[PDB]
Amino acid sequence: AKNQFGCFANVDVKGDCKRHCKAEDKEGICHGTKCKCGVPISYL
Structure with missing residues (x-):
């Protein structure tokens, strides 16, 4: 998914x-009718 990333x-x-x-x-994370990536999931 890349036109709306499933977000609305x-x-x-x-x-x-x-x-x-x-x-x-x-x-x-869904921002409007698009997406933004938040923090990296991996941590020590």
């Missing part, structure tokens, strides 16, 4: 963005 109206309604951001080893 700031919510995971139509799908998740976590599959796009997990490939960056990051959290995924």
Whole structure:
């Protein structure tokens, strides 16, 4: 998913963005009709 990352109206309604951001080893978070990656999931 890359046109809206499954996100709409700031919510995971139509799908998740976590599959796009997990490939960056990051959290995924729905901002509007798009997504932003949050922090990296990995920590020591």
